[model samples]
Target: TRRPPFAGKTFEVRYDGLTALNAYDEDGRHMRYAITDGPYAGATGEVEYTWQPVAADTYAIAWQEADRATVVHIDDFAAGTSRTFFTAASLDFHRLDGSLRAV
Candidate 1:
C-alpha cells in the first residue's frame, strides 16, 4: 500500500478505524517530522514532533522524535483524534509497529 512522507508537510493527521493500520512509510525508511504548527510551530522550536521508520522487525522502530524528551501515552490520543492545540492529550503517537494497535 501507499503512505505519506514523514517530514515537511502540513499534516492535519488522523488514524484509526479502517485507516488505522495504514500509516507506514511505503519504502521502509525513517520519516522525519519537523513541528510545523502551533506554539513554536514554524520554528521547529520548543516543540514535540512525531514520526516513524520501518523495518522487517516490526517490534523495533525508528522512534527518534519523541524518544528524547518528556512523553505521554493514553486513551486521550486515540486514532482519528485531532486538536487545534495538541499537547500530550491530543498528540498522535507512534509505536514500534508504526501503526498503533487496538487500544
Candidate 2:
C-alpha cells in the first residue's frame, strides 16, 4: 500500500461522463481548468487555485476562473463526486489511483 498520488504528476480530469478537462496540482494548489475533452481546451486568462477538505471525503476548491467555487467528494482515490457552490447537481470524476484497489 502507498499514499495516493495527489501531486507532482498529471492525472485525468473528468466531468460526470469522463469529459476530461482540467488537471490538478496539489503542491502549488494549481488547477489547469480551461476546456473540455482535453487539457487547455477552454483556457484563457487566470488559472492558479487551491482546495480545502471541508468534510469527510469532501473538498472545497477555488480558482480565479469563476465567481463561484467547486467541491469534490472522494468515494475512492480514482473515483469521486463534484458540484459547484451554485448548484445542487453533482458530477463524477476520476484520477490515477494505487495499483491495488484497497492497497
Candidate 3:
C-alpha cells in the first residue's frame, strides 16, 4: 500500500470566521481536528478519512463525523488554499473557502 502525502502533517486553516487545527496520523487513516475560532470554536473530533490526489500537491478529502455531519475539502497545498463542503447532521449544507498553512 502507498502512504498518503499528507500523512504525519499538521496544518492551521482559516476560513471566513473560523480557524482550525488539523492533524493527520502517520498512516493517514485517521485525522483529528479542533476548531480554535469560529461558531464552532472549541469543537474537536477525530474521524477516518478518504482522499485522492486532484492535482500536483493538491487533494480531495472527505470524512463523516459521529453526529452524521459530512465534510469534503479540496485542498491545494501548493497554493495554500482550500475549498470545503460541509453538511450538518440536520442536512444543512455550506460551502466555504479558506487559507491553509503548516502548523
Candidate 4:
C-alpha cells in the first residue's frame, strides 16, 4: 500500500489567529502539536485526530478534547487547506509550499 494522505507530513494549525506546526505520524494515525512560544512554549502534547472520508476528495477531521471539540473539513487534500466552525468562530489553514516553515 501507499503512504496515507497525511503520513510523514506536517501542517499549520491556526488557533487564536496564531499558527502552530502540527505533525502527523508516519503511519498517518497519530498527530502532535508542539508549543514553542508563549506560556505554553516548549510544552508538547498529543491531540487526538480522526479523519473520515466524507466525500470525494474530502475528509472530516476532528480534534478531540474533553472540554471542547473541533471538526474541520478538507475539501481538497491535495490543496492542503481546511476549515472548521466552533460556534461563531472559524479556523482555517493555508498549505505551505516547498517545505516546512518555522514553528
TM-score top scorer:
3
What is the per-residue lDDT of model 2 for residues 1-103, given as tens digits with 9 covering 90 to 100?
Answer: 2222444444344443323334555555665543444443554333565656566644455554453333333323333544433221243333322211211
Tens-place lDDT per residue, model 1, 1-103, is: 3332332322233332212111233343433333333443432322333433333212212232353533322211234233222233345643311223322
- Clash pairs, candidate 2, are 34-42, 34-43, 35-42
- What's the residue-level lDDT of 63 in candidate 1? 33
Q: What global local distance difference test value does model 3 have?
A: 0.91
Q: Which TM-score value belongs to model 2?
A: 0.44
Q: Rank the candidates by lDDT, best first.
A: 3, 4, 2, 1
> Lowest-lDDT window of 10 residues in candidate 4?
94-103
Cα error of candidate 1 at position 73, Å: 6.8
- Tell me which of candidates 1 and 4 scores higher on lDDT: 4
lDDT of 1 at 100: 37
lDDT of 3 by residue, 6-86 (tens): 889998889999889889999879999999998889999999999999899999989999999999999999999989999
lDDT minimum window of 10 residues, candidate 2: 94-103
Q: Model 1, which residues run further than 4 Å from truth?
A: 1-11, 14-24, 43-62, 70-79, 82-103
